Design a protein around this nucleic acid. Structure first.
Length: 702
DNA sequence: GCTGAGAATAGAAGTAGGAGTATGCTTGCT
């Protein structure tokens, strides 16, 4: 219908995007922050947008994220106790007299409003089933853990419960349903989390494996809500996703029968599990790559799945009780009109003979996974559709279709190698250096002057990339100590090669103290590096490894890699920072579009630069600029973050595009000025040197 | 001793101590 004017819809320190024909809008803020008071707004019929109530507010703002307080913790205590916790605030758990603790007892408020680790439970064994525990932010009603007992979970006001709200102690000793959690509106899952939590609970760990039965089979049904952003560009993103899913599931030595359904308003059936080619993975793939478009009705799609399931006669077919069914539904709307689709799930469970016994519940033979995309997804319907299994997650909510692509990219990249550059698998028990294995700390003990602390990047097995200003010719090799993988041991250096065009002595008699042009250095290690879960390389620009990371054809030029990694935009980069012996990922933006000159202009607030006539004499084409308060409140770099890699996170891989070189003001361990920018060396501009010096490291430079 | 109308993060109308994708009701007159 009619549209609204955007007069004043902007948000303090954030951006917005118009969904659904401009009739709705979502607010997006920076990492750690959430848009306040509401994330979304629609266009009214009165011309204006939705009001922002919390008490009308005129404009919106981005405000820091808090992690919830444990409503209660049975049979033990936790501390520090507080009503809310800021980001990166740790809490520890202990239990009472004679109880045993399970789960992570040193949790930490992550940047996403969730606590690190898993739910702490203090149990003894005084019940048939185990103590189901209280996930942080919930409230459990019930404390008797005998057979056939129930426990109910409640979420605070304004929060949506994902998981089971009622778990019964089943025959066994395992609980029913899945552990619940409370979800805010802005809360999204990261493609790493989705990939890991889907792979696990699709498979079992012996590498993983898919557990079918003797003379058993698997039917996989892919349902796609192609009435919105999912079915755009002829299902291109969803096509990539499902191709990689089919490949990854085929890599497990199983040949499942596939069914493929799209639905905008009516269900369109492309592949049916009855076709003899329904198990031919590449026939299914070729049929998928040719789906096309063309009110959202989901019940019809689930009924098409049910018709696939149902049999041609009263007498059963052979092997009905040995087939395992998987229903992967991808949607971005799901306001369940046209009917209530839960009844279809109940009819399905009736047909599979699930939940009709006590010794044969058969819950292993039906898995339902739901991938919601965008803010307009109904967190309640998707959770009602999906399944609930102990220690398993089946509901996911991601931000764009791009993140949904990155999910399956990450899934495909899982079991390739340890030499795969820029690969990090977010695990369940991951430490700091598990998540930044390329990181390398350089320490230089300078006489009479501050101990220089720099960072680095492991670009190959013998080399480490850093910034040249960390070193000097006075510094002997017995004062430079490099450490990778977070280990005490310092490494043995062969030679530190500086760029041939580097000189910090300027431009000295011209009135400029520091000249950081071509501020890159390569440390050649004497020994070799042993790649592992803690040491791994990072991708470099204009190498075939980065082309394979960007999912591009081998006939791609270095310029194409440039315009894919560094376009004329506000590219979202990141780096890693030392914070009390901890490695934190700080997320910044590279002003390379229309704000580039505004970034470079703020270099006159820098020491010794306040009287330079031409600012292009100190900020050369070899520099990328981050920082500032536009379009977002970028975090700044530390004195010790110097030399570290400036990373771009694309297609679930990490590509280094810059080396942290200098900053306008040094205020890091922190009101902060808006001219506080940081400048990094563009690795695309020092490429001949890198190619010449790393020609024998098997990087396959373009 | 009532409220047959409108409000309300959208917003029809019916009349409901209603409902509602983060929440979730009052007018005025005696």
């Amino acid at each position: 219908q009619g549209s609204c004017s955007l007069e004043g819809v902007e948000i303090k320190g954030g951006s917005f995007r118009l969904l659904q024909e401009g009739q709705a809008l979502e607010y997006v803020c920076p990492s750690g922050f959430y848009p306040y008071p509401v994330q979304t707004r629609t266009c009214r019929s009165t011309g204006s947008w939705s009001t922002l109530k919390t008490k009308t507010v005129r404009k919106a703002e981005c405000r820091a994220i808090h992690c919830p307080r444990p409503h209660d913790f049975e049979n033990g205590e936790y501390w520090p106790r507080s009503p809310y916790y800021n980001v990166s605030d740790e809490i520890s758990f202990h239990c009472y007299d004679g109880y045993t603790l399970r789960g992570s007892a040193n949790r930490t408020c992550q940047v996403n409003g969730r606590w690190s680790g898993q739910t702490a439970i203090c149990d003894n064994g005084a019940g048939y089933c185990s103590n189901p525990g209280i996930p942080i932010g919930t409230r459990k009603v019930g404390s008797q853990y005998r057979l056939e007992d129930s426990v109910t979970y409640h979420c605070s006001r304004g929060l949506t419960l994902r998981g089971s709200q009622r778990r019964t102690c089943q025959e066994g000793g395992s609980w029913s349903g899945t552990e619940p959690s409370c979800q805010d509106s802005f809360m999204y899952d990261t493609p790493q989390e989705v990939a890991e939590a889907f792979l696990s609970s699709l498979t079992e760990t012996i590498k993983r494996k898919i557990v079918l039965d003797p003379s058993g089979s698997m039917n996989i049904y892919l349902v796609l809500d192609g009435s919105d952003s999912i079915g755009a560009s002829n299902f291109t993103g969803a096509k990539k996703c499902l191709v990689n899913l089919i490949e990854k599931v085929a890599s497990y030595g199983v040949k499942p029968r596939y069914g493929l359904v799209t639905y905008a308003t009516y269900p369109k059936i492309w592949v049916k599990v009855s076709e003899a080619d329904s198990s031919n993975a590449d026939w299914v793939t070729k049929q998928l790559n040719e789906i096309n478009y063309e009110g959202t009705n989901t019940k019809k799609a689930l009924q098409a799945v049910y018709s696939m399931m149902s049999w041609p006669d009263d007498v059963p077919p052979e092997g009905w009780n040995r087939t395992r069914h998987v229903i992967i539904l991808m949607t971005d709307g799901l306001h369940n009109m046209g009917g209530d689709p839960i009844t279809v799930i109940d009819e399905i469970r009736d047909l599979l003979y699930i939940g009709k016994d006590r010794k044969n519940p058969r819950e292993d033979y039906l898995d339902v996974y739901v991938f919601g995309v965008g803010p307009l997804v109904n967190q309640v319907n998707i959770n009602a559709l999906a399944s609930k299994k102990d220690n398993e997650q089946h509901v996911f909510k991601v931000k764009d279709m791009e993140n949904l692509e990155d999910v399956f990219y990450q899934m495909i990249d899982e079991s390739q190698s340890l030499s795969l550059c820029g690969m990090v698998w977010e695990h369940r028990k991951g430490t700091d250096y598990h998540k930044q294995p390329w990181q390398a700390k350089i320490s230089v003990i300078r006489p009479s002057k501050g101990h220089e602390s720099c960072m680095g990047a492991v670009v190959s097995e013998y080399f480490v990339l850093t910034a040249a200003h960390c070193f000097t010719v006075d510094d002997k090799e017995h004062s430079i100590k490099v450490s990778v993988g977070g280990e005490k041991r310092d490494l043995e250096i062969e030679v530190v090669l500086f760029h041939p065009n580097y000189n910090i002595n300027g431009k000295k008699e011209a009135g400029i103290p520091e000249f950081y042009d071509y501020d890159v250095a390569l440390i050649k290690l004497k020994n070799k590096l042993k790649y592992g879960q803690t040491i791994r390389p990072i991708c470099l620009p204009c190498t075939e490894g980065t082309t394979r990371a960007l999912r591009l054809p081998p006939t791609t030029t270095c310029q194409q890699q440039k315009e894919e990694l560094l376009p004329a935009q506000d590219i979202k980069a990141l780096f890693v920072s030392e914070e009390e012996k901890k490695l934190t990922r700080k997320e910044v933006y590279i002003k390379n579009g229309d704000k580039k000159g505004s970034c470079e202009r703020d270099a006159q607030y820098a020491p010794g630069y306040d009287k330079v006539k031409d600012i292009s004499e100190v900020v050369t084409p070899r520099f990328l600029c981050t920082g500032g308060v536009s379009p977002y409140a970028d975090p700044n770099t530390c004195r010790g973050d110097s030399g570290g890699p400036l990373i771009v996170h694309k297609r679930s891989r990490f590509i280094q595009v810059g080396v942290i070189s200098w900053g306008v003001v040094d205020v890091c361990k922190n009101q902060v000025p808006a001219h506080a920018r940081d400048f990094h060396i563009n690795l695309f501009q020092v490429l001949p040197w890198l190619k010449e010096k790393l020609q024998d490291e098997d990087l396959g430079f373009l």
